[PDB]
């Protein structure tokens, strides 16, 4: 569960919630009201409430007096499973009891102010057996309507509406149990379905999809998402689903692999990590990288450390990658983001058993292309060209104001990859390998659908992102990037 996240509470409401309904060790997370784009962890300790800032400019969640994390769920799990780690003066803050949110605003199935006719239209056109939604009742204010489609324009399927009464701060379907929130009600009737008098089982199988759009209508959806904004509601609804992606990251936590990570808590999932087989004959199989498969593949990786440069080249070699996309400068804000893992132009360098020649560098407005020759030492016939695309104009914080630059870059990367017979996955990296990396990969995936299937294809931005996030933690870090993905897709369709 991710019930500890409250999307619409102020710091004052948070303070009162913890003092009146919480105990020492109670906590919640919320979006920052003082500075949008930031978050706050509000914790009760010794009868008083502490507010801890969580910053995210696009690379990771940075907790004050704490560590750097790929998601808020990974952050919460870490402190709930590793005590004495979160520090104030040096005092230890304990996250013991998540204070649960009753607000349905970020539920996939909740549609708030939506009319019964619009809901029946959506369920008829986009629905399937067990598709459901919850909307606010217009006739009886304060009440709700649960609409479910069941079946297989021939009457083989139908929509059933169930009234949800809100009586004295609790929710019920006219009889039986009375629930503290719409979520508890939905969860209960998902496990224990209501059976109609003549036998129809009202299965709440899956929330109705309202995010899948036809590509040609992107501008229309972007316009709707810009109204009071829709982008934030959709992004936060996708964020709520991150609790389902807490997969094991054991290999990255091993003592011998600790120093191979740029950020100690930003780790590759064990089930998709790139396993290195060269093996100098103790632990030579690890790199902080994951294979990203749509549904052309990618490897999403962090910026090299001085001690991981040789592992990076072994990975590029093993996977037969011919294209690298670097989305960061080596130094940003005086901080090292990626070490220079390539030789100077015309120079030849050995990185362990791998040999790399920088043949030629070409400078474009937004990027530099480096033509590299990679081979294994003592094996001349293993030589292959590796094209390194280094995007250099991405801002220090946030995203570019126009996606034109990124799109032209991605179009070039795509054409290079397509021209090379049996090229392995495209390697993509930034600093932590999750924010800018995930942003570039998601745009690439979406535009690839528009290339193949044309402008009448179906695209679903949150579905694509959830799919990439199941293969590497926190792929696409912020709301700014989420909106940038929609803007990029919109610009592409418009220039077609």
Ligand X SMILES: CC1(CN)CCN(c2ncc(Sc3cccnc3C(F)(F)F)c(=O)[nH]2)CC1
Residues taking part in catalysis: 430
Closest approach of ligand X to the CB of residue 460, in Å: 5
CB of 245: closest distance to ligand X in angstroms? Answer: 9
Stretch that binds ligand X, among 67-75, 189-197, 459-467, 484-492 (CB under 6 A): 459-467
Residues 178-197 that bind ligand X (CB under 6 A): none
The answer to whether residue 482 forms part of the interface with ligand X (CB under 6 A) is no
CB of 66 to ligand X, least distance (A): 26
Residue 492: name the closest of 426, 415, 408 by CA: 408
CA-based radius of gyration for the chain? 25
Is residue 470 at the binding interface for ligand X, with CB under 6 A as the rule?
no
Binding test (CB under 6 A) with ligand X, winner from 108, 178, 205, 376: 108
Position among 384, 460, 491, 493 found at the interface with ligand X (CB under 6 A): 460
| Residue nearest to ligand X according to CB distances in the complex | 466
Question: Phi-psi bin for 80: left (phi > 0), alpha (psi -120 to 50), beta?
Answer: alpha
Q: Which residues are annotated as a binding site for substrate?
A: 396, 430-436, 477
Beta bridge partners of 97: 26
Q: Which is nearer to ligand X, 427 or 459 (CB)?
A: 459
| Rounded least distance, CB 8 to ligand X, Å | 12
* Binding residue positions: 396, 430-436, 477
Listed ranges 73-81, 316-324, 343-351, 462-470: which one lies at the site for ligand X (CB under 6 A): 462-470
Q: Is 406 in the site for ligand X (CB under 6 A)?
A: no
Member of 106, 301, 477, 481 binding ligand X (CB under 6 A) = 106
Exactly one of 32, 157, 209, 385 binds ligand X (CB under 6 A); that residue is 209
Q: Mask 302-341, x = binds ligand X (CB under 6 A)?
A: ----------------------------------------
Q: Which stretch binds ligand X (CB under 6 A): 44-52, 116-124, 178-186, 458-466?
A: 458-466
**Percent of the chain as helix, strand, coil, to the nearest 5:** 30, 25, 45
Only one of the segments 74-82, 107-115, 361-369, 394-402 lies at the binding site for ligand X (rule: CB under 6 A); that segment is 107-115
Q: Which residues pair with 213 in a beta bridge?
A: 459
Neighbour count for residue 255 (Cβ, 10 Å): 7
Name the segment binding ligand X (CB under 6 A); options: 104-112, 143-151, 282-290, 329-337: 104-112
Residue 375 pairs with which residues in a beta bridge? 355
Q: What angle do CA 329, 331, 332 make, to 5 degrees?
A: 85
Please give the angle made by the CA atoms of 412, 399 and 328, to the nearest 5 degrees: 60
Under the binding rule (CB under 6 A), the answer on residue 431 touching ligand X is: no
Are 240 and 106 in contact by the 8 Å Cβ rule? The answer is yes
Q: Does 203 bind ligand X (CB under 6 A)?
A: no
Among 16, 206, 211, 318, binds ligand X (CB under 6 A): 211
Distance CA 269, CA 289 (A): 9
Q: How far is CA 355 from CA 317, 375, 382, 478, in A?
A: 10, 5, 10, 38
Assess contact for 489 and 218: CB atoms under 8 A. yes
Take residue 452 and report the two structure tokens written for it: 């193949």
If binding is defined by CB under 6 A, does position 479 make contact with ligand X? no
Q: Compare residues 430 and 459 and give the one whose CB is closer to ligand X.
A: 459
Query: Which residue, 443 or 465, has its beta carbon nearer to ligand X?
Result: 465
Closest to ligand X by CB, 96 or 463: 463
CB of residue 212 to ligand X, shortest distance in Å: 7
Are 80 and 28 in contact, with CB atoms under 8 Å apart?
Answer: no
Of 351-359, 362-370, 406-414, 455-463, the segment contacting ligand X by CB under 6 A is: 455-463
127 touches ligand X (CB under 6 A): no
DSSP state letters, 309-373: HHHHHHHHHHHT--EEEE-S-SEETTEESS---SPPTT-EEEETTEEEEEEEEEE-SSEEEEEEE
Number of residues written out for the chain: 496
Is the CB of 17 or the CB of 133 nearer to ligand X? 133
Alpha helices by DSSP H, 135-181: none
**Residue 23: strand, helix, or coil:** coil
Distance CA 357, CA 344 (A): 9
Q: Does 94 bind ligand X (CB under 6 A)?
A: no
Judged by phi (left if over 0) then psi (alpha if -120 to 50, else beta), residue 226 lies in: alpha
Q: Of the two residues 238 and 374, which places its CB atom closer to ligand X in the complex?
A: 238
Q: Which is nearer to ligand X, 63 or 465 (CB)?
A: 465
User: Where along the sequence are the contacts to ligand X (CB under 6 A)?
Assistant: 105-108, 110-111, 207, 209-211, 233-234, 237-238, 241, 460, 462-463, 466
């Amino acid at each position: 569960s991710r019930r500890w996240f409250h999307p619409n509470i102020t710091g004052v409401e948070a303070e009162n919630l913890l003092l009146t309904r919480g105990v020492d060790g109670s906590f919640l997370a919320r979006p920052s009201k003082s500075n949008p784009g930031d978050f706050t962890l509000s914790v009760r300790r010794n009868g008083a409430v502490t507010h801890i800032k969580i910053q995210n400019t696009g690379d990771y969640y940075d907790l004050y007096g704490g560590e750097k994390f790929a998601t808020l769920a990974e952050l919460v799990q870490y402190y709930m499973e590793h005590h004495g780690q979160l520090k104030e003066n040096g005092d230890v803050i304990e996250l013991k009891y998540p204070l649960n949110c009753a607000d349905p605003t970020s539920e996939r199935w909740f549609h708030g102010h939506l009319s019964g006719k619009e809901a029946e239209k959506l369920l008829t056109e986009k629905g399937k057996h067990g598709s459901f939604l919850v909307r606010e009742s217009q006739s009886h204010p304060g009440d709700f309507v649960l609409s479910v489609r069941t079946g297989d324009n021939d009457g083989k399927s139908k929509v059933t509406h169930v009234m949800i009464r809100c009586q004295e701060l609790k929710y019920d379907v006219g009889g039986g149990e009375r629930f503290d929130s719409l979520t508890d009600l939905v969860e209960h009737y998902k496990k224990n379905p209501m059976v109609e008098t003549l036998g129809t089982v009202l299965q709440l199988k899956q929330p109705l999809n309202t995010t899948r759009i036809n590509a040609a209508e992107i501008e229309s959806r972007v316009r709707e998402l810009s109204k009071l904004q829709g982008f934030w509601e959709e992004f936060e609804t996708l964020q709520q689903q991150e609790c389902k992606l807490l997969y094991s990251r054991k290999e990255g936590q091993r003592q011998e692999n600790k120093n191979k990570n740029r950020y100690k808590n930003i780790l590759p999932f064990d089930h998709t990590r790139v396993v290195l087989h060269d093996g100098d004959p103790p632990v030579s199989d690890y790199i902080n990288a994951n294979i990203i498969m749509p549904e052309k593949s990618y490897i999403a990786t962090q910026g090299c450390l001085q001690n991981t440069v040789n592992d990076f080249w072994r990975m590029v070699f093993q996977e037969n990658s011919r294209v690298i996309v670097m989305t960061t400068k080596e130094v940003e804000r005086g901080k090292s983001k990626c070490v220079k893992y390539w030789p100077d132009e015309y120079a030849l360098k050995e990185y362990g058993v791998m040999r790399v020649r920088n043949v030629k560098e070409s400078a474009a407005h937004d990027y530099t292309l480096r033509e590299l020759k990679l081979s294994k030492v003592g094996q001349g016939n293993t030589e292959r060209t590796v094209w390194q695309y280094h995007f250099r104009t991405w801002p220090d914080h946030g995203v570019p104001s126009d996606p034109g630059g990124v799109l032209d870059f991605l179009e070039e990367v795509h054409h290079k990859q397509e021209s090379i017979m049996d090229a392995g996955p495209v390697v993509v990296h930034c600093s932590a390998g999750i924010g800018r990396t995930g942003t570039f990969i998601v745009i690439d995936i979406l535009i690839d659908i528009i290339r193949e299937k044309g402008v009448d294809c179906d695209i679903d931005v949150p579905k694509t992102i959830q799919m990439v996030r199941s293969q590497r933690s926190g792929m696409v870090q912020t709301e700014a990037q989420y909106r940038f993905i929609y803007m990029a897709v919109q610009h592409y369709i418009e220039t077609l």
